[PDB]
Design a protein around this ligand. Structure first.
Ligand SMILES: [Ca+2]
Ligand SMILES: [Ca+2]
Ligand SMILES: [Ca+2]
Ligand SMILES: [Ca+2]
Ligand SMILES: [Mg+2]
Ligand SMILES: [Mg+2]
Lengths: 200, 198
């Protein structure tokens, strides 16, 4: 299977030193996906936020360290359940090829324990999408159950046929918080995308 | 794992011979958020209904995965115009510490219908609902060859912290209109609940 390059795929940029420290800017190489205006221009302690978090072996939020490297990404939404969806996305240089099976793998984290006076109990869910152009080709929404303080790996698969209308369009990836529970933060790590031949 | 009743789950109503209806299958509702499916339908409008699929069908390598009949969802509009399909609200309600398994066969109709080729596919999406909310979904994780049905599984665990407990379960079977020929079929809808370890 051939690995397709992804920018800051492990959220290892930026490098952090302080255990359980969290940035508050979009991870480099990723874009804030925010179709419903849930992530404000000015981010404070009490707003929706995304960024990266140093998750080591003695994390207050996870039983084991980051699935990959030191860092995971997080998408937190402060608004009420049902207000919309937001996350991270990235357009790749790779393009959709026919007779090709695409496998998009991502680790999803459900932070647990305690944060800023209040429990991290609960989980907003997740959605992971493979795109070509602005089309969602394939997606998984909440097929995996993720325990508090745990990470689980989800897989999104798609085969492009010779008749596909999206051949040659740039691939993309979206990591989404669908805001379907509180505490409404969901973490991501170790984004991988492979292509391999498929007979159709 | 206890089975959760669905109305006309295999699309066996109405009984057919030789072979298709153009009205919403009984037990199900047209899902049409983007207004692509008229109340008044013809041969050539966007459409849904039930199809008799025997062992020597023009459209499939094999007979219906279950019984005699399958459901179809056909959209006449251009690729990217929106989504539509079939949905059903169940009597059962979402329950905590429970794993739900939604199983549906997806079909890629092949061959030809009265001279018109069925080559190509619009994709699919299957959704498990509570009230108005999509709890869990699969869009196009499976590849379905022309003239084939494949089984997809959508799973969801409802925790004690879920905000949708007590809301009526539902099922949506969607044509996302990502290709032509823009017909996709479904059969043998199943839903079970079983105890989960949260
Ligand atoms: Ca990492
Ligand atoms: Ca949590
Ligand atoms: Ca049937
Ligand atoms: Ca077809
Ligand atoms: Mg914004
Ligand atoms: Mg309508």
């Amino acid at each position: 299977a051939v690995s397709i390059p992804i920018k800051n795929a492990g959220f290892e940029e930026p490098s952090l030193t302080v255990e359980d420290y969290y940035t508050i800017d979009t991870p480099p190489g990723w874009i804030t996906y925010d179709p419903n205006g849930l992530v404000p221009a000015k981010r404070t302690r009490i707003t929706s936020n995304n960024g990266v978090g140093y998750t080591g072996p003695n994390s207050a939020y996870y039983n084991h360290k980051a699935p990959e490297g030191r860092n995971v990404a997080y998408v937190y939404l402060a608004q009420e359940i049902g207000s919309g969806i937001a996350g991270l996305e990235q357009t790749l240089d790779a393009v959709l090829k026919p007779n090709t099976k695409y496998t998009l793998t991502v680790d999803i984290g459900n932070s647990g324990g305690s944060f800023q006076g209040f429990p991290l109990d609960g989980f907003p869910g997740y959605r992971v999408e493979l795109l070509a152009g602005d089309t969602v080709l394939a997606a998984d929404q909440n097929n995996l159950y993720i325990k508090e303080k745990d990470f689980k790996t989800t897989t999104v698969t798609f085969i492009a046929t010779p008749e596909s209308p999206y051949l040659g369009q740039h691939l993309g990836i979206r990591l989404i918080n669908p805001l379907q529970g509180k505490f409404s933060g969901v973490d991501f790590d170790n984004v991988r995308l492979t292509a391999e031949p498929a007979e159709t």
